[PDB]
Design an enzyme around this catalytic site. Sequence first.
Site, PDB file in Angstrom:
ATOM      1  N   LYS A 246       0.751  -1.257   0.000  1.00  0.00           N
ATOM      2  CA  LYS A 246       0.000   0.000   0.000  1.00  0.00           C
ATOM      3  C   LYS A 246       0.786   1.315   0.000  1.00  0.00           C
ATOM      4  CE  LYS A 246      -4.261   1.852   2.106  1.00  0.00           C
ATOM      5  NZ  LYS A 246      -3.936   3.285   1.807  1.00  0.00           N
ATOM      6  N   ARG A 247       1.985   1.324   0.575  1.00  0.00           N
ATOM      7  CA  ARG A 247       2.768   2.554   0.601  1.00  0.00           C
ATOM      8  C   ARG A 247       3.772   2.692  -0.541  1.00  0.00           C
ATOM      9  NH1 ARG A 247       2.018   7.689   2.741  1.00  0.00           N
ATOM     10  NH2 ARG A 247       0.957   7.577   4.777  1.00  0.00           N
TER      11      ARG A 247
END
Length: 468
Positions: A246-247
């Site tokens: 996700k990052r």
Amino acid sequence: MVVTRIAPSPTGDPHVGTAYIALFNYAWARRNGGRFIVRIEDTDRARYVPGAEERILAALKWLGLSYDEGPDVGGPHGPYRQSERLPLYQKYAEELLKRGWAYRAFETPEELEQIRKEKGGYDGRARNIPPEEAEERARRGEPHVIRLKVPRPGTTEVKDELRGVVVYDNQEIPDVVLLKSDGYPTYHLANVVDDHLMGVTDVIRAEEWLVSTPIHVLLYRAFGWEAPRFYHMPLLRNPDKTKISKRKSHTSLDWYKAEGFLPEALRNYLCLMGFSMPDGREIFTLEEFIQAFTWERVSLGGPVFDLEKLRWMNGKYIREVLSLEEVAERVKPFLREAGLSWESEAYLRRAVELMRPRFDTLKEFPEKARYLFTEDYPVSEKAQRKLEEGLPLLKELYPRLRAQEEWTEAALEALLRGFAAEKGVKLGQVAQPLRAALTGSLETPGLFEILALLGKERALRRLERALA
RNA sequence: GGCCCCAUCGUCUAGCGGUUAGGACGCGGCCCUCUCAAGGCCGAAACGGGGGUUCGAUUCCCCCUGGGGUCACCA
Ligand SMILES: Nc1ncnc2c1ncn2[C@@H]1O[C@H](COP(=O)(O)OP(=O)(O)OP(=O)(O)O)[C@@H](O)[C@H]1O
Ligand SMILES: N[C@H](CO)CCC(=O)O
Ligand SMILES: [Mg+2]
Ligand SMILES: [Mg+2]
């Protein structure tokens, strides 16, 4: 025959890893005229995200996949949500107890952490609890879990269809909890039970689960059931080769839809993650993929998800795969979101045709062609400059324009070519400043088409504010 | 670290003993051209290392290195 499945956990946004894995299960089932099942794996109330289920289901449909069994399509082996199957896992965990394949363990989470520190991992101490005592403590309501009782010492063979057999030493396999103290099952318990009862014969899932398979093979043995075939797909990666997260990357299918990526293209891109067509072709339909699929053409290296190639592919679909009308239709939600409107379908279609080769995402369309739908458009410094420098010759062209009766791209170009000649100057020297007057930009499609589009009155009305 | 999987341009990949190691994105150049794109053409760019097997390794075997994954009362 062949029954495959996708078993999403409703604990966050619809994951691209989910679509990818689902895509291969769907193809392998269709390639064999088999069944593709959707089972919701909501066994952890702590991480449960209300509303995530509907989202993942809508995203699979959006991507183009269809399932034969599942929560919202019915099926002979429901429910298809594990939270509704609790009594079942309970029944089977107890069956393991009676067969001597599991045991009750009463340690609190805090003692476990301590055991994990002292010996690194549970040491199976509860195996020494007399079964009758365990039973009594359970009847009294003492909180406990049920664990897998791994045959020690020993060895366990797992067979991956794409990698071959892997032999595990039972010392590497832990007495994992099967039933939690809240009465819920763990992934290990529910997966084997539900795959068996739902008739799955082909488990295709991400490589991250490879080491957990021996645990599954042991359970299938404990129940005396036949194990399915296992195929582990390589994990999708962030640019740095670590499992996509996700990052470091965009993993949200909602983000992709929001950004204006076409499901068809995203799907096609996903196919190239680990697979390739015999002839080498890169652009192909879902249906073609289904028909050409073969594990022989699946590669096992962890593929880096290249956002750049996806945009490229998305642009490729917009201009070569979808029709003009399909593109015009898909662009509307984005226009609406930008707060812009279009005069009519005719206008919109033409606007989309002119911009077709200039946007790679549906979202870019309202941004790069904003001046085509509102007067509220920005004017670049470079455009404002070209406009000022050309004001003199534009003033001299205006009258010729308002005099032009045949407002066509052929006539207009003829009128301007002449003006540039009679003025002894290159076309661009007149075209570029006019472009800035009409679009507030120096990067647009052809001037004649841009000029035609709005119609005589509208064009001059805008050209006037620029000369005013 | 233990266990497991994996290894071709920067990235996605074709190859299934002998090829000038091919394509695609990206990158650079050229053409087209009223701008910008699209499109066409050209180019730079890879077989991680070491041993073997073999007439002949990118391709088969082994070692190591590197990268990834996993070791929860999460999935
Ligand atoms: N990053 C990923 N790359 C490739 N496949 C993935 C990835 N993440 C999950 N999958 C696979 O896609 C399916 C999606 O399962 P799920 O919806 O539970 O996603 P998840 O990321 O594993 O969620 P959770 O955080 O609960 O573990 C599974 O079959 C899983 O193996
Ligand atoms: N609930 C899990 C989602 O990752 C199922 C994974 C699998 O066994 O295919
Ligand atoms: Mg590579
Ligand atoms: Mg080369």
